[PDB]
Design an enzyme around this catalytic site. Structure first.
Site, PDB file in Angstrom:
ATOM      1  N   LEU A   1       2.407   1.744  -3.419  1.00  0.00           N
ATOM      2  CA  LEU A   1       1.403   2.163  -4.387  1.00  0.00           C
ATOM      3  C   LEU A   1       0.993   3.613  -4.179  1.00  0.00           C
ATOM      4  O   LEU A   1       0.679   4.312  -5.149  1.00  0.00           O
ATOM      5  CB  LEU A   1       0.178   1.253  -4.301  1.00  0.00           C
ATOM      6  N   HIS A   2       0.979   4.081  -2.927  1.00  0.00           N
ATOM      7  CA  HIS A   2       0.533   5.445  -2.663  1.00  0.00           C
ATOM      8  C   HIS A   2       1.376   6.454  -3.431  1.00  0.00           C
ATOM      9  O   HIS A   2       0.844   7.346  -4.103  1.00  0.00           O
ATOM     10  CB  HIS A   2       0.588   5.733  -1.162  1.00  0.00           C
ATOM     11  N   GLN A   3       2.700   6.332  -3.339  1.00  0.00           N
ATOM     12  CA  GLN A   3       3.568   7.258  -4.054  1.00  0.00           C
ATOM     13  C   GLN A   3       3.531   7.006  -5.556  1.00  0.00           C
ATOM     14  O   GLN A   3       3.779   7.925  -6.344  1.00  0.00           O
ATOM     15  CB  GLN A   3       5.000   7.150  -3.533  1.00  0.00           C
TER      16      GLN A   3
ATOM     17  N   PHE B   1       0.835  -1.195   0.000  1.00  0.00           N
ATOM     18  CA  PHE B   1       0.000   0.000   0.000  1.00  0.00           C
ATOM     19  C   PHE B   1       0.871   1.247   0.000  1.00  0.00           C
ATOM     20  O   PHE B   1       0.605   2.207  -0.731  1.00  0.00           O
ATOM     21  CB  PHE B   1      -0.930  -0.010   1.213  1.00  0.00           C
TER      22      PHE B   1
END
Lengths: 290, 187
Positions: free
Chosen positions: B28-30, B25
Site C-alpha cells: 500500500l505504501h508504494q 502495508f
C-alpha cells in the site's frame, strides 16, 4: 485382528531441493546459463543481482508408486488386509482426484512460500522427461489460477491422468518444475532458514525438499468445521503450525488413526473424502502402530 | 470521505497474520504515496491495545473517486487470494475523532553519537560519553512485524492511534499513510 506394532510406508512424490537463480522475463524462453544467487552477509539476506527482475526455481519430482505397499509390517495378515482395502479403493475409483489436486498445486506457485507474496506474474512450466527427452510440456499461470480454489482444465486433467498412472505403477514418471516470478530489481528472496543461516547448496541458495512436499500435499479440505481458511497441508490430526490450532481433533471420528483403524479392522468404510485423505496420508508415509 | 473500502485479510496457513499485514502495508505504501492524491488514509477497525496487535482487518478511508481508481490499479490488486476486498461504502453519519500516527525515535546510542560526531567533528570518546544510558528511547506501543533491509529479524512498526474526540478535522494525509496532523473517520 490387532494392528501391527511396526508400520512404515515409503514416501511417494518425493521432490528434491529447489535451486534458485536470477534472470530477466525476456530470457524466460531460454533459462540456460542463468547466474545463480549467492548468499551474502549484512545476518544474511539474499537479493537478486543489481539488474535482475525475475526469479527462477528448478526442482525435479518422481512418482514411485505402491503407496499402500508397506515397507515393514510385523503381521502378514494385517498387510494383506490393508493391501486388499487399498486395491478395493483403487478399483472403485482411481487417484484421479488426488492427481488433479496435485496438478493444481504444481501449476500454481503454492510451493513457493514467501517469494510469491507480492508477485505480479508467476509463470510455471512443467515438463515430462522420459528417456532423457521431453515427451510433452505444459505452461500455466500461477496468478490467474486460484491458489485456494481448484478449477478444472484440459491440461490439468491430462497431467492428473499421467500422475494417476504413475502412482498406480503403469510406468516411471519424472516431472521437471520451473517457476518464474517477477518481484523487482534488488528485491529480497525468502529461502528456507537453517538452524540466521540460509540454506545453500553448491554455494547457491535453495529451498528444502520437505518444505516443498509439504505444500504439494495441501489436499485436506474435508475438516469437520470450516471457517473459510481453505485447504490444510495433509498431516495426521490436521495440525497447523502457523495458525497454532489443530483441526480434525482426535475427539471426533475424522481422525486419521481412528478412520484407518475402523476401515481396516472393523471394515467401516468412511466417507469418500476420508478415503482420499487416508490415501494421501499413506502416500506421505510415516510410522504407525506402536 | 464518502466511500469506505474494507480490506479483510483472510487467514492463510502458508503465512502468518503479522507477515501478511506487513506485506499489505508495504504494498500500500508504494500504491498511495507514488500514486498521489490529496487525502489517502486507512484505519485499523480491529485495533486493540490489550493484545498489542495491528488488527485482523483494515479500513481504507478515501473519497469515492479515489477508491474507484485505487482498487482498479494493478499494484493495489492481485492480493485478493489472501485478502477479501469489497467496494466503497458510505460511512455512518456518526463518527469519532481518531488520528493514526507513527512514533519516530532512536533506540541506539551509536546512531546519536555518530550523528553528533559527524557534524561538529567530535572524538569517538566525546560522542560515547556524551550519550548516557538515559538517551536510549523507543516506542513501546504495538508494532507490527515488518522484515526488510532495515532489520534481519521482525522489526517493529510504530503506529500511534489518536484518542477519541468529538470534533473531527479532516485533511490531506501522508504518502506512506502516516499521520499528517489530523484525525480520520472512526467507525
Amino acid at each position: 485382528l490387532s494392528t501391527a506394532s511396526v508400520l512404515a510406508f515409503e514416501r511417494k512424490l518425493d521432490p528434491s531441493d529447489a535451486l534458485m537463480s536470477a534472470g530477466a522475463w525476456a530470457q524466460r524462453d531460454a533459462s540456460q546459463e542463468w547466474p545463480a544467487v549467492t548468499v551474502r552477509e549484512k545476518v544474511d539476506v539474499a537479493n537478486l543481482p543489481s539488474d535482475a527482475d525475475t526469479l527462477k526455481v528448478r526442482f525435479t519430482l518422481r512418482v514411485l508408486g505402491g503407496a499402500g505397499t508397506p515397507s515393514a509390517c510385523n503381521d502378514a495378515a494385517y498387510r494383506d488386509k490393508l493391501l486388499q482395502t487399498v486395491a478395493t479403493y483403487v478399483n472403485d475409483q482411481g487417484f484421479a482426484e488426488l492427481a488433479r489436486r496435485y496438478a493444481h498445486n504444481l501449476a500454481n506457485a503454492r510451493f513457493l512460500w514467501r517469494n510469491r507474496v507480492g508477485a505480479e506474474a508467476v509463470e510455471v512450466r512443467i515438463n515430462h522427461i522420459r528417456q532423457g527427452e521431453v515427451a510433452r510440456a505444459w505452461r500455466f499461470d500461477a496468478l490467474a489460477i486460484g491458489l485456494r480454489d481448484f478449477k478444472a482444465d484440459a491440461e490439468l486433467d491430462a497431467l492428473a491422468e499421467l500422475i494417476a498412472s504413475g502412482l498406480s505403477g503403469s510406468g516411471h514418471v519424472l516431472l521437471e518444475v520451473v517457476a518464474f516470478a517477477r518481484i523487482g530489481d534488488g528485491q529480497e528472496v525468502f529461502p528456507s532458514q537453517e538452524l540466521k543461516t540460509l540454506y545453500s547448496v553448491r554455494d547457491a541458495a535453495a529451498i528444502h525438499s520437505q518444505k516443498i512436499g509439504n505444500a504439494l500435499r495441501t489436499i485436506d479440505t474435508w475438516y469437520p468445521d470450516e471457517d473459510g481458511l481453505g485447504p490444510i497441508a495433509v498431516e495426521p490430526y490436521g495440525s497447523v503450525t502457523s495458525q497454532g490450532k489443530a483441526y480434525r481433533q482426535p475427539k471426533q471420528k475424522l481422525d486419521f488413526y481412528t478412520l484407518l483403524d475402523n476401515w481396516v479392522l472393523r471394515d467401516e468404510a468412511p466417507a469418500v473424502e476420508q478415503q482420499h485423505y487416508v490415501i494421501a496420508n499413506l502416500i506421505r508415509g510415516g510410522v504407525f502402530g506402536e | 470521505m464518502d466511500h469506505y473500502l474494507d480490506i479483510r485479510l483472510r487467514p492463510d496457513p502458508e503465512f502468518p497474520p503479522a507477515q501478511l499485514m506487513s506485506v499489505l502495508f508495504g504494498k500500500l505504501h508504494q500504491a498511495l504515496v507514488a500514486q498521489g492524491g490529496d487525502r489517502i488514509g486507512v484505519s485499523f477497525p480491529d485495533l486493540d491495545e490489550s493484545r498489542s496487535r495491528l488488527g485482523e482487518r483494515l479500513r481504507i478511508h478515501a473519497s469515492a473517486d479515489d477508491l474507484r481508481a485505487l482498487l482498479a490499479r494493478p499494484w493495489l490488486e492481485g492480493l485478493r487470494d489472501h485478502l477479501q476486498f469489497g467496494e466503497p461504502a458510505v460511512v455512518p453519519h456518526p463518527t469519532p475523532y481518531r488520528q493514526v500516527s507513527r512514533v519516530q525515535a532512536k533506540s541506539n546510542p551509536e546512531r546519536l553519537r555518530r550523528r553528533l560526531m559527524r557534524r561538529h567533528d567530535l572524538s569517538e570518546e566525546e560522542a560515547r560519553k556524551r550519550i548516557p544510558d538515559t538517551v536510549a528511547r523507543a516506542l513501546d506501543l504495538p508494532f507490527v512485524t515488518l522484515r526488510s533491509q532495515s532489520t534481519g529479524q521482525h522489526f517493529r512498526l510504530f503506529i500511534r492511534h489518536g484518542p477519541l474526540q468529538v470534533t473531527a478535522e479532516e485533511g490531506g494525509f501522508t504518502c506512506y499513510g502516516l499521520s499528517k496532523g489530523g484525525f480520520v473517520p472512526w467507525f
